[PDB]
Amino acid sequence: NFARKVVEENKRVKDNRGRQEIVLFNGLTTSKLRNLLELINHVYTKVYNSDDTTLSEDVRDELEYLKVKFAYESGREPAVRTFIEKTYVDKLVDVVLKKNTKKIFLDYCKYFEALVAYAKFYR
Amino acid sequence: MYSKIRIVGKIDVLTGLHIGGGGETSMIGAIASPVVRDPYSRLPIIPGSSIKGKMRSLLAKHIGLIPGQKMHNQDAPEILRLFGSSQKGAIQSSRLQISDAFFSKASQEEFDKKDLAYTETKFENTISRLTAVANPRQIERVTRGASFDFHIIYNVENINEVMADFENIKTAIHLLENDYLGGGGTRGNGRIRFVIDSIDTVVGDFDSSNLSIK
Amino acid sequence: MYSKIRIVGKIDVLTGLHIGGGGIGAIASPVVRDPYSRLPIIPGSSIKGKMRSLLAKHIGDAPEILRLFGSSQKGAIQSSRLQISDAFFSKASQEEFDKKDLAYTETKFENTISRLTAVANPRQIERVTRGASFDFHIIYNVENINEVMADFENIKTAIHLLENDYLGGGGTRGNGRIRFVIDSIDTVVGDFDSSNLSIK
Amino acid sequence: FSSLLQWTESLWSYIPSSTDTNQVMDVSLYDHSKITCAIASCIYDYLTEMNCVNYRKELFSPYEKTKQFYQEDVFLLVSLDMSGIQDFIYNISGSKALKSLRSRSFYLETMLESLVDDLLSDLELSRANLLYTGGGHAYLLLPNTERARDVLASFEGEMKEWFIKIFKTDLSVAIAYKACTGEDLMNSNGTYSDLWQTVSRKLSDKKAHKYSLNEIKLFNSTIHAGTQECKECLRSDIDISEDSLCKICEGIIAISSFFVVSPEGKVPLPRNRYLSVENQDGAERKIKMNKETRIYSKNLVTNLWMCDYDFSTLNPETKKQGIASYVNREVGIPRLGVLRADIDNLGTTFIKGIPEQYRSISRTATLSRQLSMFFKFELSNILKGARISVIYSGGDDLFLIGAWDDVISKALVLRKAFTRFSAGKLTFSAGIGMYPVKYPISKMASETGVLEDLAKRGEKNQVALWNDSKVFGWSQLEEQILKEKMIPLQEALTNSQEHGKSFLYKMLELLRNEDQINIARLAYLLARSSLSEELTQSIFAWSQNKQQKVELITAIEYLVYQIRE
Amino acid sequence: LVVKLVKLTFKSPVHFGMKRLSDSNHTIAADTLFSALIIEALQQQLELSHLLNNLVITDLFPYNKTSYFLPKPLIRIEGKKGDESGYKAFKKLTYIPVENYSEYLRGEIDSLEASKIAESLNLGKASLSTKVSLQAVDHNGESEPYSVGNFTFYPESGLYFLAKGNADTIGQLEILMHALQYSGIGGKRSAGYGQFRCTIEDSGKFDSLLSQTGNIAILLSSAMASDEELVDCLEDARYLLKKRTGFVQSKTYADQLVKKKDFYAFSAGSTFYQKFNGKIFDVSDNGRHSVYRYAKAFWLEGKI
């Protein structure tokens, strides 16, 4: 339950304002993650459609572009940067590229799904 | 002899098509309305029940509906003969069986090219009449380039009524093309065009060469 | 002597198949399942009934129908020649669905817009996923070695209609479409040569 | 004298036998008086057979003869058991079975009462000698006179012949007796439970070899086939009337407020009689017209205790359809609840429950009377206001068919009441099943019996609810499954406009899986459902913890069944 | 004679009935299997002399992983001097593993151990599949629902039965069972229920068990004796009378199917101090042929 662990560790409440509000990763919302999660959905559909134990070349290039997207999103929004650094999601992308199998990308997708699900839960 | 006439063709979406359903996917989006998908392929689908319901409703409205209708069995005799009836003691089989329309292989290839997603996320809102505040909403749709392979079976129960039945089917299809398929069609979604590849009697000695629906 | 043409094949669902059960847990319109393995099945009753109905429509009770599917009328006691076993969820499709993390069944959500108030009435039906394959096992009893060829022509006609038709469920709305794949046709008991015999 | 016995039972049932506070007040005045009367009749018969000239010289004069008489085998403990009761009641098929069930059960109970009444009449004894009578089982105390043994043999032969003539292995009655010493009733030697176990073993041995040579030969040799059989309890042997109903089967239909055992009636009864339900004035007219007519009053009348609760007969519209009246609901799935409950270690309670220092004939009579009074009179008061019809009673076997939710609620109330009445020392195991209408009666009974057998395993204080995987404790079901979980979910979902029914199925589908990603999906589903946050965390924790996930699943399923359009 | 164990592994749900279509049973008596064998031998145009003159089969008993079950003998068990519910636990118990059969015949089994043996049985699960009749709907009618009770054997479980006979009789049994694998046994074998595969082999363990000689006899098949033997066997016997009834299944019996004459037989597991050999009782009346009901006796000796 690494996902729940990191979400609850980064879970925080707006005590400074004096009004109750749960803050995840210093202000992260699903709207911030929308572009990158849609990109991951694109890669997931691409890998599901293909029948191959190892990832294809197009998948690898799309994952490199996903790493670039992670960097750009980290630059644009501090909340996404906090989420990515604490969740080590880009490092897991690098690990997936190292492994180069369909199953490891399926497990990475499972991990990201757990991350976003628990983030929505604790809000 | 039991004659079954097969109508196979393409259902080109001319605008975003949103046939809602209980959806599941990776990194489930903020959308509360995801399209229906064929789970084995995860591609969007057109359920045959949607096509049959829309066609039957349009054809029944065209023929004219009995005032104070409480059931679909009170429609015109032509509608019950074509689409089937469930009335007590007067059950009529459905001559028209409308299969599910799967996402086409051609559109799948054309979207694998261009690096395009088969679906899209339309962002809408609703300006309130009182506070004049926009409430953002997100609807999943199928992009206008997509097409669907559609397969319909007509059952020849009575030989002499076949031409009238196909006239009614042509009327239903013509209404449906001008109307929308299942979605928020009054706001531009779900526009459709049928491109009939073939109409061949798969079973029976009956011939449907002269028979056309569009 | 007596012969038993054993036919083994695979039924591939082309759309969702919904053979309901009147009687796992609370499921909205559940499909029939094996009591032990809890894997969806196609009862041999459903296949036999659909094939008999389609043969009745095509031919037209008729002597061929009673000869094939059996009859119990007075002076019309004929044993059924077609013993159609249940169609069990195949092992190959079971592994293919274990991969991809795909459930064996799915929930189709439907409506019924009333003609009176135009109010959609939601509904749910379970359907076996379109990638499934069910192993089917049919036995033909060769009671008359002269009628067997005509019987198999009738069987082929029934299977052709059924492939163009639907199996159990709401077929006019797109459910239940299947396709037979006759892996083999063998005469396990007796000596009647069925090598030339072929459905589809 | 019979009327006086009924009056004594009505008055002295709650008056202690021994006024002394130091002496234990378990046996009431009525029980002690009834046992005294039975024993007095037995010893009077024994001495009359012995032709004793002086009674005080026989037992009192030296006071050695008193203990000598206590040593002598003066008594007989007799047991009659009817085999085939449950098969007769529940193995019926057809639309008329759902109305003939209770009629068949009452017919069997009245037949047993008529049997024991005939036995007492032959022996010239009152119903005081009848120690106990429950579910096809009757225990009596009789004199050890040779006339008594001859009467027992003649009665056994007559009843076997009659039951073979009418039912032909569908129902049988076996009667076995053991000679009993007065000290055994006093349990001075600690031989009371030994006597009871010996008589039970003799009864079982008689049940093993139930039929003789000529009876088997007559069974196998049949002239012609029936060529027509009854719709329920299909019997080809007897002449099947029109509409395909047997003579017994149609009479049981005709039966469905006193019970009259007269020369003319509906359903055949032993010693060439017939049972018919009659109005009070009609029953009195039958008594006047026909001499030697026994009449039984439900809860010259011989008062009979039997639970007759039936919600259908309360309302005229529901009188037409016995249980199809229960199945129809405006909201909630139209199903039937079948309860098969059983007291556990009842034989152990009679034998080992009573300590050897407290074993006696009067103690056993008091215990059996208490059990019967609970399961025949108090049961109806427990079930008041519920769509439940009770087919059988007596503790050793129960059957309460009705709406599933009403059945489970009244099963909980029955457990609470049984805990109160027994004050501990007694736990009963229950099986509850839910079946659609037109489900076969035999299948309902058998599957709920399987559930009851499952609940009897291990600790016997268990309820097997619906599917066999839902075996819980009564505290677990009453509080944790229903009060703790089901009620908050009902509140939160009845607040919603759709009443759930789509969220609950998603919840169940996610709970069926054990994948961790399915746990994450459940978290997301709960988050999107927009429940109260505390309830959401409670549900998530319940799903995380095994043995609470099952309770959550059962609460969800109960809620889904509660709202089904 | 030669003794062969036949192990039946069922590939499909099985409908074994007692009295109704909804009733599902996990076993069949020897009469049902003998009827199936006679039907098969008639279909295969084979003689009935061997089956009617020398074949001695038993009922079909459960079996599972490393255990073959036998019927619970009807012996006088002493039970526990403390509790009577032990006898209830013994009566609930129905099948004894072959290994524990001698122990049970010698007592040595507690009520808790009896319930453990009863629950150790791993023979499938019964269910009720509801089907419909749509033939009335075409000519202005309603669909008629109806239930069929079926039984699904667990993957390594199944049924078995011993068969005793000559070499020729054993060969005919092998051929008939090979045909019956595809003919099926049950009550809906023309609607999918009852398809099974048989394996016929000689078992050393069960042959040794039969070779065991004891003071009492135990019936392994639903049987009944003629009058000359019924006058002697019933002395000091503990049995159970089963009411064997059924409709005739044959095309040539009559224009319409009619019931057989009701029969009564001693259930398997009954205990007799005197042994008897049964007869093939004819239970047909005014029929074109003679319906055969199997009541021969398969005896297992025991020490009590």
From Swiss-Prot, chain A:
Biological role: CRISPR (clustered regularly interspaced short palindromic repeat) is an adaptive immune system that provides protection against mobile genetic elements (viruses, transposable elements and conjugative plasmids). CRISPR clusters contain spacers, sequences complementary to antecedent mobile elements, and target invading nucleic acids. CRISPR clusters are transcribed and processed into CRISPR RNA (crRNA).
Family: Belongs to the CRISPR-associated Csm2 family.
Organism domain of life: Bacteria
Entry protein name: CRISPR system Cms protein Csm2
CDD domains in UniProt: Csm2_III-A (cd09647)
This protein's encoding gene: csm2
GO terms classed as biological process: defense response to virus
Taxonomic source organism: Enterococcus italicus (strain DSM 15952 / CCUG 50447 / LMG 22039 / TP 1.5)
Further comment found in the protein's record: Encoded in a type III-A CRISPR locus.
Lineage per the UniProt record: Bacteria, Bacillati, Bacillota, Bacilli, Lactobacillales
GO molecular function: RNA binding
From Swiss-Prot, chain B:
Transmembrane portions of the chain: none
One Pfam family here: RAMPs
Listed GO biological process terms: defense response to virus
Signal peptide interval: none
Cysteines engaged in disulfide bonds, as pairs: none
Stretches of the chain forming a coiled coil according to its record: none
GO MF, any single term: endonuclease activity
EC number: 3.1.-.-
Keywords: Antiviral defense, Endonuclease, Hydrolase, Nuclease, RNA-binding
Enzyme class label: hydrolase
NCBIfam families named in the record: cas7_TM1809
Misc. remarks from the entry: Encoded in a type III-A CRISPR locus.
Job of this protein: CRISPR (clustered regularly interspaced short palindromic repeat) is an adaptive immune system that provides protection against mobile genetic elements (viruses, transposable elements and conjugative plasmids). CRISPR clusters contain spacers, sequences complementary to antecedent mobile elements, and target invading nucleic acids. CRISPR clusters are transcribed and processed into CRISPR RNA (crRNA).
Family the UniProt entry places it in: Belongs to the CRISPR-associated Csm3 family.
Subunit and interaction comment: Part of the Csm effector complex that includes Cas10, Csm2, Csm3, Csm4 and Csm5.
Official protein name in the record: CRISPR system Cms endoribonuclease Csm3
Organism: Enterococcus italicus (strain DSM 15952 / CCUG 50447 / LMG 22039 / TP 1.5)
Gene name of the encoded protein: csm3
Swiss-Prot record, chain C:
NCBIfam families per UniProt: cas7_TM1809
Domain of life per record: Bacteria
Top-level taxonomy: Bacteria, Bacillati, Bacillota, Bacilli, Lactobacillales
Enzyme class: hydrolase
Extra facts: Encoded in a type III-A CRISPR locus.
Transcription found in the keyword field: no
Record text on subunit structure and interactions: Part of the Csm effector complex that includes Cas10, Csm2, Csm3, Csm4 and Csm5.
Name of the protein: CRISPR system Cms endoribonuclease Csm3
Family of the protein in this entry: Belongs to the CRISPR-associated Csm3 family.
EC number(s) from the headed UniProt entry: 3.1.-.-
PANTHER family linked to this entry: CRISPR SYSTEM CMS ENDORIBONUCLEASE CSM3
UniProt keyword annotations, A-Z: Antiviral defense, Endonuclease, Hydrolase, Nuclease, RNA-binding
One Pfam family this sequence matches: RAMPs
Organism (species): Enterococcus italicus (strain DSM 15952 / CCUG 50447 / LMG 22039 / TP 1.5)
Function: CRISPR (clustered regularly interspaced short palindromic repeat) is an adaptive immune system that provides protection against mobile genetic elements (viruses, transposable elements and conjugative plasmids). CRISPR clusters contain spacers, sequences complementary to antecedent mobile elements, and target invading nucleic acids. CRISPR clusters are transcribed and processed into CRISPR RNA (crRNA). This subunit has the target ssRNA endonuclease activity; it cleaves multiple sites in the target RNA at 6 nucleotide intervals.
Cleavable signal peptide: none
GO molecular function, a single term: RNA binding
GO annotation (BP), single: defense response to virus
Swiss-Prot record, chain D:
Limits of the GGDEF domain: 334-468
Domain of life according to the entry: Bacteria
Regulation of its activity: Synthesis of cA6 is inhibited by EDTA.
GO biological process: defense response to virus
Cofactor annotation remark: Synthesis of cA6 requires Mg(2+).
Cofactors demanded by this protein: Mg(2+)
A single GO molecular function term of this UniProt record: transferase activity
E.C. designation(s): 3.1.-.-, 2.7.7.-
Record key words, sorted: Antiviral defense, ATP-binding, Endonuclease, Exonuclease, Hydrolase, Nuclease, Nucleotide-binding, RNA-binding, Transferase
Record flagged with keyword Nucleotide-binding: yes
Known catalytic reactions: 6 ATP = cyclic hexaadenylate + 6 diphosphate
Family, as annotated: Belongs to the CRISPR-associated Cas10/Csm1 family.
Record remark on domains: The N-terminal HD domain has ssDNase activity. The C-terminal GGDEF domain has the cOA synthesis activity.
Additional observations: Encoded in a type III-A CRISPR locus.
Primary role: CRISPR (clustered regularly interspaced short palindromic repeat) is an adaptive immune system that provides protection against mobile genetic elements (viruses, transposable elements and conjugative plasmids). CRISPR clusters contain spacers, sequences complementary to antecedent mobile elements, and target invading nucleic acids. CRISPR clusters are transcribed and processed into CRISPR RNA (crRNA). ssDNase activity is stimulated in the ternary Csm effector complex; binding of cognate target RNA activates the ssDNase, as the target RNA is degraded ssDNA activity decreases.
Record's subunit section: Part of the Csm effector complex that includes Cas10, Csm2, Csm3, Csm4 and Csm5.
Full-sequence range covered: 176 to 753 of 755
